[PDB]
């Protein structure tokens, strides 16, 4: 199986630097060019740069948007791709994806990573407060209030509850984000069985399991 996994995203101040990495497996890494692409929240994909394969000397190219300011390298021993970003600005806030690129034969990006989110801001890391939302079917939820930066993750019962979940996009207010998540199950099953929301906020290493208690 081909795997590409980005790491390194988070919060950085304007004028700062940040290096992303992209760990790969499941293909002959040195045979492939690798690209980085970014996406500001809600906006279009933007190609940033590539680094070519061994046959082409692992040479690099960049979009004019980032040339001179971003550097791509690769570790061919470990099949890891890097993106060095310097002099970051508000407009650099985006999800960064690495993509497997050209092999000499095909014109396509066959595989993409999950993306890592970069926030360029002077605001401080603030962990969320997590609150339970208790009242045929029953709807329950969790309120994930007053955190910075994005993202947070929310699962229900460690992911075994997935259908009938709605997790609502975070809204920014007074420099903090708030989101909520609902889950709908049969009332014969709650509170008869436990329902827990699992919230993570990578920026503050926050991990929370909030059991939804009745009455």
């Amino acid at each position: 199986e081909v795997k590409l996994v980005e790491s390194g995203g988070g919060l950085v101040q304007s004028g700062g630097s940040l290096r992303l990495s992209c760990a790969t497996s499941g293909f002959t890494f040195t045979d492939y060019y690798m690209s980085w692409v970014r996406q500001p929240p809600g906006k279009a994909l933007e190609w940033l740069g590539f680094i070519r394969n061994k046959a082409n000397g692992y040479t690099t190219e960049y979009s004019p948007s980032v040339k001179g300011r971003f550097t791509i390298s690769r570790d061919n021993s470990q099949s890891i791709l890097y993106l060095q970003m310097n002099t970051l600005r508000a407009e650099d806030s985006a999800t960064y994806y690495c993509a497997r690129d050209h092999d000499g034969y095909y014109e396509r990006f066959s595989y993409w990573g999950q993306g890592t989110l970069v926030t360029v801001s002077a605001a401080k890391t603030t962990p969320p407060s997590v609150y339970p939302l208790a009242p045929s079917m029953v709807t329950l939820g969790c309120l994930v209030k007053g955190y910075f930066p994005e993202p947070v993750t929310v699962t229900w019962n460690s992911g075994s509850l997935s259908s009938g979940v709605h997790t609502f996009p975070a809204v920014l207010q007074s420099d903090l984000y708030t989101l909520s998540s609902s889950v709908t199950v049969p009332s014969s099953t709650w509170p008869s069985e436990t329902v827990t929301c699992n919230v993570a906020h990578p920026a503050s290493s926050t991990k929370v399991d909030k059991k939804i208690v009745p009455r």
Binding site: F50, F109, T167, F168
Partner: protein
């Protein structure tokens, strides 16, 4: 120097209908050496990474349903989806690799479906939030269609609009509905002055608002 532009910006189609969307390049993408147009299409479903669909303008990647067809040549390309499924909800990007790489601005495909009324639930503030001096009341309005909806908050029967944050989901990939969350935040001292908290949803599905409420005395 290659500009990529896509049309429409957005559209909605019912399941089973045909979708066509366009991709224009500022210069030809037909490589003369290989005789292929270096134009690929990617699909990006809500909350996911982009996925390769079509490359060299018309070759459909293995594992991609045959309802997806890429066509075109030179500076003009098309992606057609026949018998669209709810699951095809996505932003579609075209991308040239003739000279480095450049993406178009995307086409957002929404799915049209039958009108559906929301399922509304209201939630009082948790004791843990109240202990800290704040009071958030939450209303979910789930699985409705179309996206346009109105929510009013009433406290002791009087509308209150300040202190309200609203959020919609992306459309659902299996039922083509939307959901919305509305959160009213008050001080604890303000919250403790009033009894009745009401979330009222008015959607095109009924002339009657859907009203959910709780009374603090009953907590």
């Amino acid at each position: 120097d290659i500009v990529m532009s896509q049309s429409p910006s957005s559209l909605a189609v019912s399941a089973g209908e045909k979708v066509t969307m366009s991709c224009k390049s500022s210069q030809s993408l037909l490589n003369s050496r290989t005789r292929k147009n270096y134009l690929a299409w990617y699909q990006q479903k809500p909350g996911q990474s982009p996925k390769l669909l079509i490359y060299w303008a018309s070759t459909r990647e293995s594992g991609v349903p045959d309802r997806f067809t890429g066509s075109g040549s030179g500076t003009d390309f098309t992606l057609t989806i026949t018998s669209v499924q709810a699951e095809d909800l996505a932003v579609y990007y075209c991308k040239q690799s003739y000279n480095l790489r450049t993406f178009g601005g995307g086409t957002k495909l929404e799915i049209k479906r039958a009108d559906a009324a929301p399922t509304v639930s209201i939630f009082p503030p948790s004791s843990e939030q109240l202990t800290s001096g704040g009071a958030s009341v939450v209303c979910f309005l789930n699985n409705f269609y179309p996206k346009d909806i109105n929510v009013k908050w009433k406290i002791d029967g009087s509308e209150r609009q300040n202190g309200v944050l609203n959020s919609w989901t992306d459309q659902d990939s299996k039922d083509s509905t939307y959901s919305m969350s509305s959160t009213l935040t008050l001080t604890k001292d303000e919250y403790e002055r009033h009894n009745s908290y009401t979330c009222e949803a008015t959607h095109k599905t009924s002339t009657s608002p859907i009203v959910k409420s709780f009374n603090r005395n009953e907590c």
